[model samples]
Target chain A: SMARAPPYQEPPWGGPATAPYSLETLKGGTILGTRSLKGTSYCLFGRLSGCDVCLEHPSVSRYHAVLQHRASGPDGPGFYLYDLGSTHGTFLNKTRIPPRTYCRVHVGHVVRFGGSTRLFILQG
Target chain B: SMARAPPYQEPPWGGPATAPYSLETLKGGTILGTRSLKGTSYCLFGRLSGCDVCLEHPSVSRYHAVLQHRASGPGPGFYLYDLGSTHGTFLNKTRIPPRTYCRVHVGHVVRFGGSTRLFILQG
Candidate 1:
């Protein structure tokens, strides 16, 4: 179920959606992981057991990549993602990120670690 | 006449505030010029007789600046400004230099010519 528009609304002047900013995982039509981090979190598909978001999919990487919510930027309070040198690289917006490079992500970027738990990055 | 919340509303996917886009001027406590330009209009405090939003204050220059509603990548459909005037234009809190285009998004505050506290956003 695509999660309903968040219960809480953001102040007109924006910032992170919530404390421990989250990345929404959409499986079929459902939106999961609303109660997910503490600013910068690792999007771990499983190599390390304590990865922020752990996945069971076979192609997912242990220390796949990282998504960070920083308080400064041209667009302050923006989110960024970096690929952490994996067997199969990460793809953003359907384009492959060169291993270890970072890109500023906005509301609707599609992030795929290997090919499993595809997540749609949003402010809330 | 800082106007009341816009009489009309906007559709969420987001485009311009009403149509073309508007620049509000605050003098005293009154908000003026809620009904303003087409896409790209000049902020003329007066050098040009037909400036988009005109003013009579002493410190203002005739052709102070220009604000345009442009297609954008960095911040959706937003406003871009040129400090063509003398005292300069300020977006929300920062001073924008002359001969340059700067970005202004919805709900972001703007100050033009010192007297007017402006807001250019998709309200």
Candidate 2:
């Protein structure tokens, strides 16, 4: 099931500045991912846009969240999302989520996107 | 990988008669899936209704194919398909297929039904 994500006072919570390397550059800014999700030690390796599950915050746009996460990487923060404005409406696990957000995801939880659905895999 | 399926045949190629028992009333037929699937040992356990990937048979109305797969199973063959008797001419793995079909020794081939297309296992 999906729940509402927390709010963000700034444009990017785990930006290159905030969480150290949630948006860091390792191979001269090529491969990027999350530093480490808050409670879960597994690093988020992908980015999903137009996702209602990740865009539960009212302030975040789907497009922006996707770009930030794509440019982010290990050593910084975990997941921060973008909610691109859509016409069909967005939802996660049947729950209608808000936009412009930030949420800490855990393993086994289904984070959804527009396509098939965003899948969560716990790093071993 | 959205390849086209094949064309259709008559009433039902391997209905209750042709093949062994792709559609039997086992356990009162609570479940139905494809048997041998030609080359694959794994049974095709699930069926889809409105797939443009599975249907290529000109005679098979999309509605009919879905029901047949759902109704038949367990050692019973899976999938009601097309061999390409209609337009939108069917295509599978680049080669246009024949209706009323099955996978050969290789389980990696694909098939079709109305507008739907899918993999053809040994079942």
Candidate 3:
């Protein structure tokens, strides 16, 4: 009989398969909703539908921003946010980040899209 | 005559076409070569070939670090991120946060892992 190989299961990028990060919606210092960041890239857009994270606002663009998870870094596997040259902009810790640039979002960092009052807080 | 559309002559990302920054390789206070950063991202690795900047040292990882250029910020410039390496990446003699992007200004020195080569950011 031929020996069978064990089923392959790990993520190809060599990190834990579980969701390593979460983005929590906050307004008036209260949690509104939470979304888990599971894949290597997550898109936040302004479309009424068909985006990983969608915001319903005029200031948000169709493809506003992207969060990319790289396998290796100074701090191991982590996510970086890149603003896709949106109309308004993407802010980190209340300051607007440059377009097409990758910004490191650490735990407890507050992220806001375009001119929206809502906040997305990074959480481990 | 049909009016031809104005030539689309701008960068897709809306930044200037010219190189806004450069990296200078240095050893023992002598400049070796300078590389202009013309793209959005540049990778620094230890592989013998295929990386934007290759460091021929065992202490450096295969994909060691990256330099990314951004169009807007308090100061628009290149940012450095060390891709988790065994020895680690250094900025001005201090080990930088792994995988985190930090802005690198002109004159700032970057060293990868235990390698003796220094890369200085230049305008």
Candidate 4:
């Protein structure tokens, strides 16, 4: 006999849904990785293998940054980038965004992880 | 015999590339209009029909705000510039400095003056 699965509960970051966007990792004009961003929240980790996206650079922190999807009444659903006080920092375009703040990110935007040469470009 | 037609050319805004983003106008939690943003730059104006994005409210300026796309070596993205409007332009509920370009990300909300209609950036 097989056991029954438990009822699903929404995670604190929200529930799983179809990914509205994806990310393309580039370095020196070459493509490295392409990831479809699914669920309501995704984490970018450095050394930990449990993260959604892992950057194996020493400069990146274990818990580097997070991309979250949030929705309001009229504003609709959107994605946000939050840095977890990394050593080098998280950059949007070229400016380093403040840590722990909800920074909005959109398609065609480029994001860099701590001193990494790779660029994470947002795509539809 | 007719002379040859002029050569085809791309507009200054940009070539005929597909729009990477769109904007939705909302009022009182109801969607008003959704516009696909095409080209490299888009403008928001009040009464001027020549503007790319037009807002009909009187409080909005004739040439209100501009969304511009700029590409760097590694960083290529879009930004929003307020054209010194009287009522001012806001990003995520905070008023941005006039004549300065502010970065725009997806899901960001923008409002012109005190207009009830909100502009939401989407992709």
Q: What's the DockQ for every one of the candidates?
A: 0.02, 0.02, 0.01, 0.06
Query: Which pairs in model 4 have colliding backbones?
Result: A105-B106, A106-B106
Q: Rank the candidate models, highest TM-score first.
A: 4, 3, 1, 2
Candidate 3 root-mean-square deviation in Å: 21.0
lDDT by candidate, in order shown: 0.50, 0.30, 0.62, 0.64
- Candidates in order, TM-scores: namely 0.41, 0.23, 0.41, 0.46
lDDT of 4: 0.64
Q: Which digits, one per residue and each the tens of the lDDT, describe model 2 over residues A1-124? A: 8985632233433443232222211121112232332232222222334332243333333432232332255431244333344333333323444554444432212233443222222111
List runs of model 3 lying over 4 Å from the truth: A1-124, B1-17, B72-74
User: Candidate 3, clashing residue pairs?
Assistant: A73-B84, A73-B99, A74-B98, A74-B99, A75-B98
Over B22-53, each residue of candidate 2 has an lDDT whose tens digit, in order, gives 21111111112333222322222112233422
User: TM-scores of the first chain across all predictions?
Assistant: 0.66, 0.33, 0.74, 0.76
Model 2's alpha-carbon lDDT is 0.30
Any runs in candidate 4 off by more than 4 Å, and if so which? A1-19, A71-77, B1-6, B9-123
Evaluated on CA atoms against the true complex, candidate 2 attains a DockQ of 0.02
For model 1, residues B34-53, the per-residue Cα lDDT tens digits are 54445432333343455555
> How close is chain B to the truth by TM-score, in each candidate?
0.60, 0.26, 0.76, 0.76
TM-score of 3: 0.41
The best candidate in terms of TM-score: 4
Scored against the native two-chain complex, candidate 4 gets a DockQ of 0.06
Off by over 4 Å in 2: A1-12, A16-77, A89-94, A115-124, B1-123
Best by DockQ: 4
